[PDB]
Structure 1
């Protein structure tokens, strides 16, 4: 799994705790050229500071709000002109309003539901469509999901239905872009203390339950997600597509 002369776009670093910073640390350490995309200017600033700890000899940062067709279209188009063709995309992007991450699911608003869908699932489809233009030779696209896409986990509410959508999106992209030699997979990460986690009702309780009940008796970290991301983005996984790998201490396997 050595990746020199590989280029990967990582979407969704906000700070040093971001899962996508785990991927980045692991890919960068394996010698890959990286390009980063962000939404808030605070994320770019965090990216500028975190690039000091990476080996990247230059900073490729692109502002892409995935709610914008044109910002995605022109973002990847630009990445293509700056660095040429890419080997894959790590997609670490999701959003839901805080109302919608606690209390009663049946009370979700249309606007809150569609917002979570647009950012957390559909952004993958359009990223894939635009990213494919930079992978004339094939490549690898990995999204980040959560077990709550597969089962009804208390509080995760609108995001779980967005992750269900995301997971199917992976399969349909896998089928569609398969003949083009682009593999499309997901990582189902265990719960990890991140900026966005602070918004999920009951997140602390779940951390403690993994540690008590999951087979490895411990929580996972971002580097662990990065290690599997390296596998999925590299040749090591050449016959794997439409797959969902649980990086979660075995929790998905137990009841």
Structure 2
């Protein structure tokens, strides 16, 4: 058969566009979501027009038992997996002094713990045909301060560190692991930020490139990192931000 790709959180936004790009390149697709079922089924219908097979799996990736159920479905339906894009994220955006334990656990479980358990199940499927590629999506708040972003920034720093440990430990399985970090993108996720207009204004005005990052720019780097043209890039996080992080003022 043909190669298969899973993209977590692919009902909308970056994940959806990544799943479509992989489908355009001949991959069968696993679409994943937590609650936005209608958008997930609509994405699946769009992608099936390309002549690939699509499996839609509801699985909150913050719960390893749901991860394991999802991968059992992938194994039953396709019997293989070749590309895995860890893209889903959630979070609680408030000042650090107001954070509660549930806010930390929710965010860390979905955004960083997910990669460890998805990577384990992905590797077991990838070993069947000789390897594969894993790419995670991160942001500038892993290494810099974004206002109100503590829970998510800390999870993304864990995610990038996990990307390094997996990149070393899964190399014997011929699995290539890396991450792509973005500057701000005008998706539904920005609506979580009470300072949404400030972020957009800053991206529009202060990005050296002269425009904001778009979903296509993140997808283009994902595509490269799964393409076989990037097999000796390992454990790296590539920053796609139009040059915004280079500045001071």
TM-score (norm 1): 0.89
Q: Give the length in aligned residue pairs.
A: 244
Alignment correspondent of 1:227: 220
* Rounded Cα–Cα distance in structure 2 between residues aligned with 1:133 and 1:250: 38
**Does structure 2 conserve the Cα–Cα contact (< 8 Å) formed by 1:22 and 1:225?**
no
1:36-74: CA deviation from partner (whole Å, max 9, x where unpaired)? 12211xx23212222333314433111212232222112
1:70 partnered with 2:50: no
CA displacement at 1:253 relative to structure 2 = 2.5
Alignment correspondent of 2:177: 184
**Does structure 2 conserve the Cα–Cα contact (< 8 Å) formed by 1:190 and 1:248?**
yes
**Does structure 2 conserve the Cα–Cα contact (< 8 Å) formed by 1:36 and 1:60?**
yes
Alignment correspondent of 1:130: 121
1:195 partnered with 2:192: no
Aligned to 1:142, what secondary structure does the other structure show?
strand
* Rounded Cα–Cα distance in structure 2 between residues aligned with 1:219 and 1:109: 33
CA displacement at 1:107 relative to structure 2 = 2.6
1:209 partnered with 2:206: no
Alignment correspondent of 1:21: 16
* Rounded Cα–Cα distance in structure 2 between residues aligned with 1:203 and 1:56: 38
**Does structure 1 conserve the Cα–Cα contact (< 8 Å) formed by 2:63 and 2:110?**
no
TM-score (norm 2): 0.91
Alignment correspondent of 2:96: 105
Alignment of 1:139-154 (within 5 A): 139-154=132-147
CA displacement at 1:124 relative to structure 2 = 0.3
Q: Which protein, 1 or 2, shows the higher relative CO under an 8 Å CA cutoff with sep ≥ 6?
A: 1
Alignment correspondent of 2:46: 53
* Rounded Cα–Cα distance in structure 2 between residues aligned with 1:121 and 1:69: 12
1:151-199: CA deviation from partner (whole Å, max 9, x where unpaired)? 1122212111111111111111112212211111111122122222211
**Does structure 2 conserve the Cα–Cα contact (< 8 Å) formed by 1:24 and 1:226?**
no
Q: Which runs of 5+ in 2 are unaligned?
A: none
Alignment correspondent of 1:155: 148
**Does structure 1 conserve the Cα–Cα contact (< 8 Å) formed by 2:134 and 2:175?**
yes
Q: Which runs of 5+ in 1 are unaligned?
A: none
Aligned to 2:67, what secondary structure does the other structure show?
helix
* Rounded Cα–Cα distance in structure 2 between residues aligned with 1:203 and 1:183: 35
* Rounded Cα–Cα distance in structure 2 between residues aligned with 1:154 and 1:195: 18
